[PDB]
């Protein structure tokens, strides 16, 4: 419940008042709706970065956030698009076994996918996600930032290199 006042100023010597009142009401209503729809994303992001992150609920942030696929950002890292699903399983096992709390988990309970995203403890917004759905035959690597990116990038490429390091390491082991 909010109370709003509308003034119209500019020596003593209305339809415009009604029109301005209506336009202001519409603008504030749409702004309130947008703010309500956008604050949920920020709150869920804060909760996830801090724990009680429901796997079926975290998908809402992915729908809201405009994550960028690895193929889009750089072509040199395009051959990874040809890696088999088992390679992704090996990668997930390796980083989950080795890496500390800086890697989170999100798995579909029954016959679904799993997410073992890794985000730097300080690099907010920007994060790395691992899509692995053997049932649908869909494996995707995308960079997820919690804000539209005009294209920050220094830290974004920092942990990106730190993450891609393990990907070659897993591929090196399979090449051994």
């Amino acid at each position: 419940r909010l109370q709003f006042f509308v003034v119209l100023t500019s020596f003593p010597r209305f339809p415009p008042l009604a029109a301005e009142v209506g336009m202001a009401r519409a603008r504030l209503a749409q702004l309130v709706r947008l703010a309500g729809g956008h604050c949920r994303r920020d709150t869920l992001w804060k909760r996830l970065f801090l724990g009680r992150l429901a796997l079926a609920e975290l998908e809402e942030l992915l729908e809201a956030v405009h994550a960028k696929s690895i193929g889009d950002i750089d072509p040199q890292l395009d051959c990874f698009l040809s890696m088999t699903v088992s390679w992704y399983q090996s990668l997930i096992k390796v980083l989950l076994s080795r890496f500390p709390q800086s890697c989170r988990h999100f798995q579909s309970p029954d016959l679904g996918t799993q997410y073992l995203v890794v985000l730097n403890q300080k690099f907010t917004d920007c994060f790395v996600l691992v899509f692995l759905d053997s049932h649908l035959g869909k494996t995707s690597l995308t960079v997820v930032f919690r804000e539209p990116f005009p294209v920050q990038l220094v830290s974004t490429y920092h942990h990106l290199e730190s993450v891609i390091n393990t990907a070659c390491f897993t591929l090196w082991t399979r090449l051994l």
């Binding site: 040199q76 080795r98 591929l171 082991t173």
Partner: protein
């Protein structure tokens, strides 16, 4: 057509490295039925001759020979061209196919030309084998020229196996050759990518032994094993971070030549102080560290000591108090090191810092440090360094390009 069965035997049976079972019936399919027409006889004889020629070609025994594959293949094109002619009459198979195989014969002549030029390239490579060090970028360019010259001009359905098989090996060589460059140029990621691509393509090309393989098969496995061992030795410190002190040992105790295993076993042979391989990276500015970084990442430039780093320094770290004494000899007496053969000796006052030197490659060197001055370890370090240089060059495989 009736001959479709014979063609689908000969082709798609030659592709599994099996030649005699179809070369025997190539003449049978034309001699059992004496009456024939068109090319249904000359084509079969040329097919048997081509099977024998390809068997000789994948024998690899025609190297140097101080008859050649070029001599055999010169008549191979004619044996198909003569059959694929405007034979209007006096034969007779069908006045809708008749020749039919004229396009296939032109495709096979183009494939014969490709085989001959690949054999010539391989013979030139074998000639380069005796060299101390052979560059790879120009050979890569020549092979890519061969690719462009012989790409997508000879494919018909029945030729799908051959077109693949041949191509597979060739691109594998490309993936090897670039890797040989990228390994020599320290290009970690491109070399790894090429290695994986070549391994994947080989795991398809060389899969006829279950469902003896020719000499080029074992030769390419030997080359790949040497390449991956070189990759493991060159790029070891970065990968050693994402593992423990034992998993790396298990991983590196499998790939031959086992450079890491030999180094670990020979460190205690003299209780030395440091073993470090230095990379001569001068002339380039893309160097930023041991790992991967985003392409457009602004970095600094090397200067002085950083010009010559100890990337694989062992067992603990490179020394920062004796490094000046060994950094300045990389260009003072390095004339004999440039021959990729000599070994350096040194001796200090009130200190036993004595460094050796081996130069397997112009951009690579081994500068093994010892803290003794007694008897130079009976010149065993020089022999070990020479063996290491030979293994890193690995010209033994290129000499074994000929069978035996």
């Amino acid at each position: 057509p009736v001959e479709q069965a014979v063609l689908e035997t000969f082709f798609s049976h030659l592709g599994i490295f099996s030649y005699d079972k179809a070369k025997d019936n190539v003449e049978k399919e034309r001699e059992a039925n004496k009456s024939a027409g068109g090319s249904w006889l000359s084509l079969l004889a040329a097919l048997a001759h081509l099977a024998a020629a390809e068997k000789v070609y994948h024998s690899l025994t025609y190297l140097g020979q101080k008859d050649s594959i070029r001599t055999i293949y010169t008549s191979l094109h004619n044996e198909l061209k003569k059959v694929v002619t405007g034979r209007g009459a006096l034969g007779g198979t069908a006045p809708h196919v008749e020749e039919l195989l004229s396009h296939l014969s032109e495709q096979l002549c183009f494939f014969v030309q490709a085989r001959m030029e690949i054999a010539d390239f391989y013979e030139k490579m074998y000639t380069l084998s005796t060299q101390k060090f052979i560059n790879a970028e120009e050979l890569v360019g020549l092979l890519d020229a061969i690719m462009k010259k012989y790409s997508s001009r000879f494919h018909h359905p029945i030729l799908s196996p051959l077109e693949s098989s041949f191509q597979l090996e060739v691109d594998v060589l490309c993936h090897l050759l670039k890797a040989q460059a990228q390994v020599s140029e320290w290009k970690f990621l491109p070399s790894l990518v090429n290695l994986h691509s070549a391994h994947t393509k080989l795991q398809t090309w060389g899969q006829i032994f279950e469902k003896q393989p020719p000499h080029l098969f074992l030769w390419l496995m030997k080359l790949k094993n040497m390449l991956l061992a070189k990759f493991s030795f060159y790029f070891h410190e970065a990968l050693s971070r994402q593992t423990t002190a034992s998993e790396m040992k298990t991983l590196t105790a499998k790939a031959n030549p086992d450079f890491f295993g030999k180094i670990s076993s020979f460190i205690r042979k003299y209780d030395a102080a440091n073993v470090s391989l230095i990379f001569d990276n001068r002339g380039s500015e893309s160097f930023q560290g041991h790992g991967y970084h985003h392409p457009h990442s602004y970095r600094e430039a090397p200067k002085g000591v950083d010009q010559y780093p100890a990337v694989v320094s062992l067992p603990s770290d490179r020394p920062v108090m004796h490094w000046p004494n060994v950094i300045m000899i990389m260009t003072d007496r390095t004339s004999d090191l440039n021959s990729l053969e000599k070994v350096v000796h040194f001796y200090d006052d009130k200190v036993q810092s004595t460094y050796f030197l081996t130069r397997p490659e112009p951009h690579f060197t081994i500068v093994i440090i010892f803290e003794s001055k007694k008897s130079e370890r009976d010149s065993h370090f020089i022999s070990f360094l020479n063996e290491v240089s030979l293994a890193l060059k690995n010209p033994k495989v290129f000499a074994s390009l000929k069978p035996g």
